[PDB]
Amino acid sequence: SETFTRDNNMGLVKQCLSSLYKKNIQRLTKTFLTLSLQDMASRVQLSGPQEAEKYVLHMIEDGEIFASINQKDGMVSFHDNPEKYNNPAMLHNIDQEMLKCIELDERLKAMDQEITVNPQF
């Protein structure tokens, strides 16, 4: 702690701790579909289903996990299906990404032309 405060980056290491918790909750999607909040609190090491519900809600809001909360049964339902790639949204996304690659190629064309004008080696 003294070495991390000496470098004046204490805070980012706390974000590393929170990201480790989030990584542990993100590892549950690969194996579970419908998981209890108490089971999640026991596996991720959070103590109580309340903190598990907090973490899951934060992660859904920030777009980090694709899940839903069932309070009645006390369960978490992982979905894991953001897109099927039929939206125009993807059309516009691909159009923008392609325009970025076209920009990059035109820059490379300019660099190559600039080098062709220069003397030989």
Next chain:
Amino acid sequence: VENPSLDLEQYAASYSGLMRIERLQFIADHCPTLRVEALKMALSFVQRTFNVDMYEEIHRKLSEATRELQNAPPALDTAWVEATRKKALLKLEKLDTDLKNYKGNSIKESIRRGHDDLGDHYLDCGDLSNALKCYSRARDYCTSAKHVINMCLNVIKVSVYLQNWSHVLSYVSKAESTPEIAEQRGERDSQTQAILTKLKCAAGLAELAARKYKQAAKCLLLASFDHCDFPELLSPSNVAIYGGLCALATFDRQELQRNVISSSSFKLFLELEPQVRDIIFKFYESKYASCLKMLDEMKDNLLLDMYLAPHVRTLYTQIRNRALIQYFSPYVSADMHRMAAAFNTTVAALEDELTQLILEGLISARVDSHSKILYARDVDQRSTTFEKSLLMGKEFQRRAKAMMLRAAVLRNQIHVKSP
């Protein structure tokens, strides 16, 4: 470590020599209660073939055992030890005299045979390094392929006790390539002397010690039953156990069906040990409950075996995992309670095991722990292709920006100076 199902008498009767000695010592060191009988049999056979060091080790251990036997609720024969030392030294002088005589006569057959007898007596006395040196010198006095084959078999025999399995495999391949690739045809209408069987068994044990269980099983399955007795390496019942467990752990369903079940050569070995045969058949018939039951019934008894024990964790874990996959293979949606009952475990323990099996292994499923149902996961082809393509484009763009700036710093010669 306790199992009274072991039959020490028959187990000692099946093997011979240092193999019998080291196996009895393994049963004595790893298994108590049966230690007394193992020490008594070990002592009785150590008195045979003439050995001093082994007699001192076994006598020390038997005295400590008798002390423990008196703590629960044979005398040191130095005359025989000194007589044995005198007999061994005088016989070594006789063998030296005859060896020097044949070396003076200069006869390839006589010198080679002298080194062979020399090596046999060096093995009987208890010299582990010199016994190999005798055959190592005997190498040069060979003409026909048969002499080299016998020599290699002796080198392999000693190297098993020295634990040099790479050399075993090397001299196995040597003895397989020297006689015009196993006499090409097969000595016409089969051979009375089964040498190929001994080679595949030695290579099988060598591949087993090297933790390569698939090749070990592949060599052990090819060995024929007609060789019968071979106490210098491994008994046919153990050949069935080693080969059976290794093949069950590494070979898949098609491979087990073609190379283990339909194999007529290994069938006899499967008839010797019916428990292993039942385990393989129950694994193929999808009867995993009785299969794991018989496998756990064998576990403690196979734990006492000399060469099989240091793999008993791996094999069993490999088998169980494979079984779990073979159980879930034909299902899209499976009940975890029936699965837990079929694998002799609890639903939460099965849930943990399956979670580990999805994280790395061949199971491509999701666990629904609320309803206790294991659902098989099907990958969306289109979304996966789009996802990895989009991410590749992103990584390509970052690499392009990075090399753009690298071009700029290499052009302007921007670097950190040393002073």
